[PDB]
Design a protein around this ligand. Structure first.
Ligand SMILES: O=C(NC1CC1)c1ccc(Cl)c(Nc2nncc3c2cnn3-c2c(F)cccc2F)c1
Length: 357
């Protein structure tokens, strides 16, 4: 058993790209801004050490406030935990800073992907086999994310990244923090959200993400957003029209008195026939869709269970659907100063050990 006693610091070079000065290790070459701001300050690059096309995100002044500092620490902790084919993970993390004292920039390095689901949908008409392989991969990655006791919270086509070979990685898990305005009106930001988080019926858990997969799957099959509500209330009515109004058993699970009061005011509707809604679709696709889009979150199919569904017969491999280690999120309930979040972040950067690729 031999041991490493110190870490080598690479040579860095400077470059002005996003109107900001990027300082990166020599290994990273041909830096080029991607996404026209949709992903933030992200550059595509070639990693000469691994031969990988990579995405490099710069977080400038990430310790400006207590919230920003904790968010910076949260994102890093999240990315360091994920080692899965269908989940975005960390290839590298670096700072040009030689001490904690001068440390005010964090760079994150992930795999470079070709497009998000939104963009591949406008370029192609997806076959049932594409939908099989894409949804299989989302669920495979979700099984892993959920086994680490992490909730995505904001699964939508725009944070599902896809390659030319139809291989998929899940982005933006565990960190989505939206304003009221961003969730207002006729907006994609809300169309995929489970009814219980959209209107805050109860304390939410991972089953929230399965609802989102159901909405995504339906849209891939039909070419149409499943619940494109013009507001929160219009969306809910769309949802209940399809899945029926709550029964007595679900009503008493709704911890919010006011939300329970509003629900009971609505004319009761039965669940529709999904075979008459999703006409011409693989009957197995429709079956799984019914097990995902259940109003009561307790009764929804889980990611692990859905993997064993007959719809994924040609892709399902129980020996190649791995779980994660537990994710220690005890820091979430911790109140700390800016300098304490910064030091914690610095610790995580310098302690990073690269994958054996
Ligand atoms: O999900 C992330 N963080 C949350 C989970 C904690 C996270 C953080 C940093 C980075 Cl660098 C990334 N990776 C990426 N971020 N945006 C777009 C990305 C991408 C990788 N590829 N692409 C990409 C592209 F460059 C062009 C077109 C389509 C694409 F999906 C993800």
């Amino acid at each position: 058993h031999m041991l490493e006693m110190s870490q080598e610091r690479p040579t860095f070079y400077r470059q002005e790209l996003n109107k900001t000065i990027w300082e990166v290790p020599e290994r990273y070459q041909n830096l080029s801004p991607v996404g026209s701001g949709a992903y933030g300050s992200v550059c595509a690059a070639f990693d000469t050490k691994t031969g990988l096309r990579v995405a490099v995100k710069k977080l400038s002044r990430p310790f400006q406030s207590i919230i920003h500092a904790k968010r910076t620490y949260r994102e890093l902790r999240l990315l360091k935990h994920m080692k899965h084919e269908n989940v975005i993970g960390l290839l590298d993390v670096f700072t040009p800073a030689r001490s904690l004292e001068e440390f005010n920039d964090v760079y994150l390095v992930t795999h470079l992907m070709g497009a998000d689901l939104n963009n591949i949908v406008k370029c192609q008409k997806l076959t049932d086999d594409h939908v099989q392989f894409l949804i299989y991969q989302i669920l495979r990655g979700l099984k892993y994310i959920h086994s680490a006791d992490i909730i995505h919270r904001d699964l939508k086509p725009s944070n599902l990244a896809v390659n030319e070979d139809c291989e998929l990685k899940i982005l933006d898990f565990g960190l989505a923090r939206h304003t009221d305005d961003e969730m207002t009106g006729y907006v994609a930001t809300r169309w995929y959200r489970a009814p219980e988080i959209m209107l805050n019926w109860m304390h939410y858990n991972q089953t929230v993400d399965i609802w989102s997969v159901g909405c995504i799957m339906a849209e891939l099959l039909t070419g149409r957003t499943l619940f494109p509500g013009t507001d929160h209330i219009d969306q809910l009515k769309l949802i209940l029209r399809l899945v029926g109004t709550p029964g007595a058993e679900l009503l008493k699970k709704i911890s919010s008195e006011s939300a329970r009061n509003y629900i009971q005011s609505l004319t009761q509707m039965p669940k529709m026939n999904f075979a008459n809604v999703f006409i011409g679709a693989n009957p197995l696709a429709v079956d799984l869709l019914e097990k995902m889009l259940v109003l009561d979150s307790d009764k929804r199919i889980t990611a692990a269970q859905a993997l064993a569904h007959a719809y994924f017969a040609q892709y399902h491999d129980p020996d190649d659907e791995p779980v994660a280690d537990p994710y220690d999120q005890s820091f979430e309930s911790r109140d700390l100063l800016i300098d304490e979040w910064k030091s914690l972040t610095y610790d995580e950067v310098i302690s990073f050990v690269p994958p054996p690729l």
